[PDB]
Symmetry: C5
Subunit: 230 residues, 5 copies
C-alpha cells in the first residue's frame, strides 16, 4: 500500500562501464556463461535486484553498458559491485565510467508519485538515465509556488503514460541532487517526453542534467557480451 511504498528503504545504483579495447578477446562463450551465473546467483541470494543490464553502444564516447541494481542497504550494492568487478571476466575487462546512486524518498507534495521500480512495474525495454541538479533557489522558494510548478510539470507529462518515471534523491551519494530514469517501450517516446517537458516553468529552476546514458535493456547478458569490442 501507499504508505508502505513511501516508507520503504531502497538504494538504487546505475553503474556504467566502458570496455577496454584488447581486453575481452573473441572467445566469449564461457565469459557469457560465467556472467549469467553471476547474476542468476545474485537473483537467488535475494539481496540485490538487477532491474536491467543495458547496451549503451552508440550513446556516447567512453561508455558501453550499464547495470541498474537495487537493494535495501547500500552496503549490498557495494558488495555486488565489488564482486562483479573481481569475480567475473566481464568486470575484470571493464572500466567504471560513471556511478549514479540514489535513495528512495517520499515526494514533497504528491505522495502518490513513486518510482516505477518501487511500484514494482516491469522495467521498460528502453531507458535514459541522467543526474539532476536544481537551481539554488528551488527548495527555499515559497512552497506553494514550487508546488504549483511541480503540478504543472506533472501535467505536461500526461501525454506520456507509457513512459515510466523514476525521480530519486541522490544527495551526498555523488555530485548530484537527483537520479532520473525514464523507461519506455520505444526510444522515440523518451526523446519526445524530454522535448515536451522543456515547455514547463520548472525548466527555469535547473542547474545540471548531464551526462545522459540511453540504451536498450538486454534480455540476457549474452546479448551485451557478444557486442562489446574485443
Amino acid at each position: 500500500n501507499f504508505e508502505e511504498l513511501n516508507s520503504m528503504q531502497r538504494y538504487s545504483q546505475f553503474a556504467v562501464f566502458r570496455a577496454i579495447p584488447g581486453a575481452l578477446g573473441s572467445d566469449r562463450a564461457e565469459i557469457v556463461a560465467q556472467a549469467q551465473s553471476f547474476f542468476d546467483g545474485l537473483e537467488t541470494a535475494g539481496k540485490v535486484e538487477v532491474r536491467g543490464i543495458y547496451d549503451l553502444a552508440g550513446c556516447r564516447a567512453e561508455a558501453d553498458f550499464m547495470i541498474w541494481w537495487i537493494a535495501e542497504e547500500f552496503e549490498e550494492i557495494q558488495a555486488a559491485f565489488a564482486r562483479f568487478r573481481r569475480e567475473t571476466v566481464l568486470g575484470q575487462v571493464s572500466e567504471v565510467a560513471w556511478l549514479g546512486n540514489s535513495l528512495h524518498r517520499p515526494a514533497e507534495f504528491n505522495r502518490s508519485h513513486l518510482p516505477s521500480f518501487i511500484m514494482g512495474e516491469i522495467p521498460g525495454d528502453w531507458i535514459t538515465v541522467y543526474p539532476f541538479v536544481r537551481s539554488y533557489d528551488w527548495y527555499i522558494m515559497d512552497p506553494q509556488k514550487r508546488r504549483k510548478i511541480l503540478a504543472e510539470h506533472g501535467q505536461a507529462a500526461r501525454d506520456f503514460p507509457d513512459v515510466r518515471a523514476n525521480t530519486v534523491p541522490a544527495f551526498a551519494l555523488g555530485d548530484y541532487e537527483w537520479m532520473l530514469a525514464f523507461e519506455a517501450p520505444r526510444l522515440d517516446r523518451i526523446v519526445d517526453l524530454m522535448h515536451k517537458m522543456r515547455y514547463t516553468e520548472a525548466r527555469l529552476h535547473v542547474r545540471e542534467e548531464t551526462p545522459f546514458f540511453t540504451g536498450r535493456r538486454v534480455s540476457e547478458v549474452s546479448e551485451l557480451v557478444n557486442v562489446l569490442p574485443g
Copy 2:
C-alpha cells in the same frame, strides 16, 4: 503534406591512435570497405558520408554519418565497426552525435537535407545545440517570429543545406545540427551571418564542432591518417 519517415541519425567521430595503424594499411582498408559494402547490402543503415576531419581539432580525425529507421540498427553497426574491423579496433571513439527526425514546431516544410534525399555536401560542419532555459516556455508566436527571422537571415545561402534534428535524451544535447555545402567558406560565412539574429539571445551550448571533407571511399580517408 507529411513525409512519414522515422529516421535516427548518428555522427560517430573517431580519433586515430598514433602508432596503431602503422604503414601497412592495405588490408585494413580492404577490410573496412568490405564492412561498409556489407552495410549497404543489408539495407538498414545508410551511410551518408565518411569525413576527413584532419586539422579541424585535436583529438578527432574522422567521422561517419549513418542513418537508420531504428536506433538499434545503428548500435549494431557502430558496435560491429568497432568489434570486427581493425580500423575500428585501432581507433578511439571521440564523440557521438545522435538525433531523431521530428517535424518542426511551426513550419512543416522545414526538413533536413538527408530526409529530403538531397545530395551530400562536399564539406560539412556538425555540432550539438542547447537552447536557453527560457526558450521553449517563451510565448509561441514570439518564438515563431524569431525562428522565421532566423531563417530569413540564411536566404543568401541556398547552396548550404541544413539538418536540424532533435537530440533530446540521445546524449547531452537538445539538437543535432549539420550544414553541408560545396565549399567550406560558404559554411563559415553562413554561421557568421546567422549571428545577426535575435535567436542568438536564447542559446546555452553549441560545441564541440566537427568540420571536414567528404571522401569518396574509405581508402581516401585511411591513407591520410597518422597511424
Copy 3:
C-alpha cells in the same frame, strides 16, 4: 573547554586515492603487513593522527579510498603523505585522486560550533566529504544578516544530532574556501540531512560544493586492501 579548542592549531587532510587496475594482484599479504606497519609507525611517532581510513566503493568513478589524518603542523602531513606514496607498495600502486586540506578556526558567530574531530568525538561509521565555496557576496554581506542566515542554517539541522559536522576553513590549501565532513552511523542519515539543508536561505550564497566522497570507515587497513579492485 571551548576556548582552548578554538585556539588549537590543527590541519586536516582528506587524501583520496584510486587503485591502479592490475597493480595489486592476488598476493597482497606483504602489502597489508607493510601498510599497517606504516600506520602503526605514525601512531607511535605521535604527530599525525589517523581519524579514519574509508572504503569509497560504489561512490564514484576514479576514487577507491580515503585517508583522514590530522596534525598540528601541515609539514607533518606532507611528510606522512609523501612517505605513504614513496615507501609503501599500497601507496606506490595507488594514484592520488584528490586532496582536501583544511585548518581549524573558530567560527565567526557561534564559538560553540566546533568540528567533531576537534571535540574528540568518536568518528562515524559513514562519512561524506566535500569542498565548499561561498558566493562572492557572502563575506561582505552585513554581519547581522550573515549571522541570522547561519543561525537558521544551523536550526535546519535540528533533527540530525547524530550526524556530526566538521566545517573547516580551506582557503589557500587548494581551490576551495571550506572543507566539509559529515559523520554518521548510517548513510541514509547523511542523505536526508543534505536534502533538508537545501531548505535554507544559505543556499542562495553558494558557488561550488563538488566533488563528493562518501564511504564507510574500516577498522584497519587489512579490511581496505583486501576489498580493492585488482
Copy 4:
C-alpha cells in the same frame, strides 16, 4: 577600401604540438634534416606558406611548439598537416595539442582593418595566439552601437603601432568565433597592449578567450628541435 585584399581567400591555421618525452632522443640531426626537407617541399609547391615556427617552451603545460601556415584552400592545410604528422619523425614523435583555424574576411565597419599576414607584413619575433568568442548579444546589437564600441576599441590600441593584429573569423572551423594573433618585436609590448585593452567597453561583450599560446619565432627548424625534451 582595400578592395582586392578584403576579397582574397586565405585560410590560416595555428597548429600547436606537444613533445612526447623520451621520443626524440639526442641524435636529432637526421630528424632535423627530414623536417627541413618537409618545409622546403611546401615552399616549392607554393600552396602552403609557413609564416612562422614558434618555440612555446614555458608558456603552458602540454604545448611545446606551433606552426602558423596559410593557404588559399583549407584542404591544402589539411594535407600538409596530415603529412607532417604521418611522414616526418618530428610529427610522429609529437602530439597535436590544439588547432586554431580561421578564414580572412573584410571587417564589418573599418575596411582598412586587415590582418598583418594579409597585408604581407614581416612576421613579428614574438607572438601570442588565442581564440575568441563574443557575448551572445554582440552581433544582434544595434550596428551603430557596435560600431561605436569597435571604434573605441581600435582607438585604445593607439599607442601600440608596433603590435600587429590578426583578427580573423573562425566560425565553424572549430569551437570559436575569431582567431587572434598579435605579433610584436618584444613580448612586453604584447603584455602591455592586452592590459590596456581591458579599458574598453568591448570587454563587456566577451564570452571566451582561452587557451593562449605565446612564443618566440625561430629562424629555422633546427633551433626549435634542439630545444625540445628528448
Copy 5:
C-alpha cells in the same frame, strides 16, 4: 616613487611539476648532485634567479614541486625551463603540470605597491601561488571607484605585514590576468589572510582564481628530491 623598481623589467615564472610514478626510483644521490649543478650553473650565468624551490607534497592531486625563477628577458626563462627538462634527469622524470608566467609592472594607483621579489625581500618559508582574473567590468569602472576599492582591499590586509604579496600582470603569458604569490614564515597566516581578504568589495569583481599551489621552500634540492614518489 620607487621609480627604478617600478621601471625595471622582470619576468617571473612559477613552474609546477608532478612526479611520474615509477620514473625516479630509489637511486637519487646523483640525480640530486646533477640538479644542484644545473641550479649552480644558472646562478653563475647570472641571468635566471631562482627565488625558491617548493615542496608541494599534499597540496593537490597531480602536482609535486615548483620552481620560482625570475629573469629580465622571458627567453632566458624559456631556455632555463627547457634546459631543465632536457638536460637533467630530474627534468626528464618529471611532467610539467602548470605554468604561471608574469611580467612586473607599476601598480595602477599606488606606486609604492611592489612585489616582494622586486623589493629584494628574502623569500618566505611558505608560499601560495595562484592565477587571477577580474570581472569584465573591473577595468572600465570609474577609476576613482576602482581606486577606492583597491585602497580598502589594501587596508583589509593591514594586520598581515608578515605575509608578503606579489601581484603581477599575466596578460598574454597564459590564460590569466594576474599571477599572485603570497609568502610568509607560517602557512596559517597565509590561510588567515586569504579568509580576511574575502571581507572586501573587490570580491564582487572576480572571475577566476584557481588552481592554487601551496607549499614549503626547501633549503637544498636534496630535501625536495628525497621526498618525491619513486
